[PDB]
Amino acid sequence: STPIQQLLEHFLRQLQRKDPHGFFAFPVTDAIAPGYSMIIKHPMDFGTMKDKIVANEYKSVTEFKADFKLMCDNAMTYNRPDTVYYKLAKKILHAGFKMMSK
């Protein structure tokens, strides 16, 4: 486990605590979100991010932050503003970037 992986695993646990219901925990399927694979070209979720840390696939916090922002941007694109998913995505994107930029 490198010092960079450890940093990223710490950031991921803290980000996942902001999603207590697990809405971002695993990939969104078309069965639960009709037309999702048509609308969202580059899906992302926390479980995929955790796997990428473990695989040593992030070179920097910067590349980690981009996967987090992609996850949140996808939820704000697919879901209408007045939904629980849109609201959480907008909220945790802002609070998560602030947390990582302290």
Partner: peptide
């Protein structure tokens, strides 16, 4: 719409 979306997830309902």
């Amino acid at each position: 719409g979306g997830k309902g």
